[PDB]
Ligand binder design. Sequence first.
Ligand SMILES: C[C@@H](Oc1cc(-n2cnc3ccc(CN4CCN(C)CC4)cc32)sc1C(N)=O)c1ccccc1C(F)(F)F
Ligand SMILES: C[C@@H](Oc1cc(-n2cnc3ccc(CN4CCN(C)CC4)cc32)sc1C(N)=O)c1ccccc1C(F)(F)F
Ligand SMILES: [Cl-]
Lengths: 297, 288
Amino acid sequence: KEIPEVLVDPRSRRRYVRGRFLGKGGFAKCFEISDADTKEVFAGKIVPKSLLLKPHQREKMSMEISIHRSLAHQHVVGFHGFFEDNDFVFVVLELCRRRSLLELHKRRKALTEPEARYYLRQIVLGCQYLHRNRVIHRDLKLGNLFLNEDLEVKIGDFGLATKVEYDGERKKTLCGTPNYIAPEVLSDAGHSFEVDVWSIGCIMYTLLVGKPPFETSCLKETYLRIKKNEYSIPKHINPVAASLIQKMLQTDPTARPTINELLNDEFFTSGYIPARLPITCLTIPPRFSIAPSSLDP
Amino acid sequence: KEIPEVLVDPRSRRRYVRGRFLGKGGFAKCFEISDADTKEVFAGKIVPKSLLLKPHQREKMSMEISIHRSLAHQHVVGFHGFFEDNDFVFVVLELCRRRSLLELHKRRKALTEPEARYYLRQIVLGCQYLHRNRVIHRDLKLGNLFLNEDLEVKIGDFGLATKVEYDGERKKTLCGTPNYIAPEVLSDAGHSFEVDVWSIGCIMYTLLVGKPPFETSCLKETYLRIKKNEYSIPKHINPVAASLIQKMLQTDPTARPTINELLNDEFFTSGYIPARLPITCLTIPPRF
Ligand SMILES: C[C@@H](Oc1cc(-n2cnc3ccc(CN4CCN(C)CC4)cc32)sc1C(N)=O)c1ccccc1C(F)(F)F
Ligand SMILES: C[C@@H](Oc1cc(-n2cnc3ccc(CN4CCN(C)CC4)cc32)sc1C(N)=O)c1ccccc1C(F)(F)F
Ligand SMILES: [Cl-]
């Protein structure tokens, strides 16, 4: 089944022109689309209804939309609406013109500490909003931490997300395999908000070190290292940053910081956080003083 | 970790006395130092080994030294040797007593055309030597164009410099952010010797106009102007000078003059070049 050249909404009679191809997310394909009337450009997620025939996939799609449409925060990908024809489901999302932290990490590898801190603070602010709205993402990775023109982080891809119905509710079932598998998900012990802090722990490590904390050449060794909490922080990592990674990457979920305690860590409160990053930071490391002061030209 | 009062070389047993503070280059600190034996005064670059613990910083430091130690030209800062203790790396460089073109430009702003031509010819001569030795500086700015007692230009600071291994090699990765970002570096398209001509273009503009060609109050507008090659030459600039700036500041790297063609421009061949500049030119405009 071919994808339509123009995407028409039965209800609001809104019509979008299928522009540049952006990429595919497993089962879904993503295109740059523009409203023919207003000329406003969006990120169109397009899922073949042929691949939703399995009821367990319809649950996943409906749950993703239900969660994403209820969210509105400057560090969460905007949800502008959804619709369907008889062949495809169309989801209209905020366009983040600088792709995601995955593309940045592939080009730059290890970031400077101020860059890491700049990105991580926004990731935590976004996740804080989710957790306060009783949402667990359960699949935070570089690839779904999107970047807009101003290099502001936007959390997207709620494909594995669940809503907590009461305070201390623990979940078992996932409709897919998270990128950063927390030890309580691997052991099938039940999980809550703490999985998001684990993945933020893996993300922080990757940004500062330039490679993942657990990932090896084979998944069998990868998952054994996660089970036994076997990872090594290079001595070149600063003591405050090293400390915060150790807090987040703990086997005991109750031992990890909450998202509120995470934001109030010395790493953020006592560390230099740039107000802006120059656009050159996508490809080349920026200059920072040993002791940056807001009393300087 | 405190910096030693006297700097001792394990090999050669050479010993220098840490004199007047000259300034800091981001991660490095620079001091006026003198050989206790010969009394010869040098510029000592001192880098804490604590800040080199990240291997990708050790590559940058070793590459800078490797390139700089292989160079010997009257328009390139002399490299007299390097050594280390367990806490610091020490690099001994030629002392340029009149600092750099940045300090001159801050005091004088727009130079006269003969002054501009005098400085630019030496900058090009230095860069010509680099390019002939398959070296791209990639960070030429007023701040690393140093001036000796006689106001002769010396190119220093090979912190972002790379050596070209083969004919037609194009480079991607920079270990820092150049002051004058060429459009092919901004677009991550690959770059070669042409970036040096771009920066010489920006430098020539700044010397004659008294402000940078692209730099605005915000970096977002600055980088958009570079991408689209949006800049304005004041009508008061002479036509031959204006022409040469237009040749160097082109988006297409292949369209720019080479460093050899640059030197043979009408601006240099047909323009008045002073043999010397008087020391008063640091603070007040000279007569010709
Ligand atoms: C299905 C798609 O969903 C999106 C897309 C979004 N998106 C918004 N603006 C964007 C600008 C560019 C890119 C391009 N992709 C290429 C692959 N890369 C790993 C991430 C950026 C994607 C952009 S947000 C969002 C979401 N679900 O919230 C998606 C989700 C997760 C990983 C990859 C994609 C996909 F590759 F398909 F794009
Ligand atoms: C790290 C240092 O390295 C040097 C220093 C050199 N140098 C030689 N004689 C000199 C007389 C005075 C001054 C002082 N600076 C103050 C700042 N100004 C922008 C330039 C002159 C520096 C002199 S040459 C040279 C080099 N790497 O080739 C350096 C490189 C680039 C910009 C600044 C400095 C630093 F500020 F640290 F000095
Ligand atoms: Cl990992």
